[PDB]
Design a protein around this nucleic acid. Structure first.
Lengths: 203, 203
DNA sequence: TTATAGATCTATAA
DNA sequence: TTATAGATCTATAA
């Protein structure tokens, strides 16, 4: 595939270039190596795209996983408990999972187990190949990368999205670089307050 | 239905109380009037909830629409064009739609027509009944309410979500108040920088 | 024809 | 059994 567009939020790319120049190579190489055409297997079933052959997010994901894991990118998961009272949540943010549930219940409140996953993380960098309903991009950007960033676990979040010419050939509901780029640019240029690298591949 | 939980971000509620006290009444009344049990019509088809009767987001939405429109809440839509180059986007943020496309193409760039909808807006208040893929809540919060807020069109965003006891009876993928509340609380208490009122109904 | 939104199924892991 | 994620269809409007 080919890196058609690349945007650097709050110097997210320049950070990689200066401290992990090899990672930048790695990421680019990995992208260029995937044969998107080999991933064109999904037969749309929507009434509007009847009998059409689109690129498969499932295939494209398998392609990225295999390649990325092979390079050392491992998954990271954060478990936590949430409750209805905001002040209780604030008092449990620094504690450990088991410990949070404890302080919550120790107040007659209910403790709900949740978590956040990210299949690719390395040297404090988080990669998100995002081919799902477009709302996940804002979720990835304002919730996840930001979560890791403030938690001092990541130093820059990377979000890979398909350009409009690629999403134009995947099932409905999927986001496209151009648009998401807007969602970030639209609101000044310090929001979200997390270094990022939006990459918009698209062969 | 019943307002089980209510969170006020950056004094979003106190703003309504002091300038549109009647709106607060209105919103509460509207919520209390809807018969959720009458909206229990969707027969799940998932392999895990086989032959179970859940509450319908479709019904619950129709209930909210009818009631809210009846009270004067109208829809608002913002059209705009996006392009791949970030600097071009920055130069077109203040212009009018037709005008944006013009400046974009007048540089050999492609202009992609997009937009943002919000079914309920009144007296500079935006309501979002959100019963869709959980990622839409972060999208509603960090992208839409924020968009209106910075654009000086809204003064406080309102987000209505179902508590865990309600989402526990709707199809998979739907968010629940408790959790989303966390996503906001998790990152300090000035992020996002837009006054909000998260309401977690749940009968 | 198409864009954003909303509706719902399934995949994996704990 | 269940939670978060990811996969995809459809509804409405311009």
């Amino acid at each position: 595939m080919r890196i058609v567009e690349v945007y650097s939020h709050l110097n997210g790319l320049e950070y990689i270039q200066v401290h992990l120049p090899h990672i930048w190579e790695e990421i680019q190489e990995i992208i260029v190596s995937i044969d998107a055409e080999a991933c064109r297997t999904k037969e749309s079933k929507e009434k509007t795209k009847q009998g059409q052959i689109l690129y498969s997010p499932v295939a494209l994901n398998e392609a990225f996983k295999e390649k990325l894991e092979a390079k050392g990118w491992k998954e990271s998961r954060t478990n936590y408990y949430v409750t209805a009272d905001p002040k209780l949540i604030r008092e449990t943010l620094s504690l450990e999972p088991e410990e949070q549930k404890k302080v919550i219940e120790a107040a007659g409140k209910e403790a709900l187990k949740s978590y956040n996953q990210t299949d690719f993380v390395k040297d404090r960098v988080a990669i998100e190949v995002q081919f799902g309903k477009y709302s996940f991009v804002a979720y990835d950007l304002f919730v996840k990368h930001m979560a890791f960033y403030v938690s001092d676990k990541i130093d820059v979040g990377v979000e890979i999205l398909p350009m409009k010419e690629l999403s134009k050939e995947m099932s409905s509901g999927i986001s496209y670089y151009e648009g998401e780029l807007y969602n970030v640019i639209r609101q000044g240029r310090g929001v979200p307050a997390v270094p990022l690298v939006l990459i918009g591949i698209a062969p």
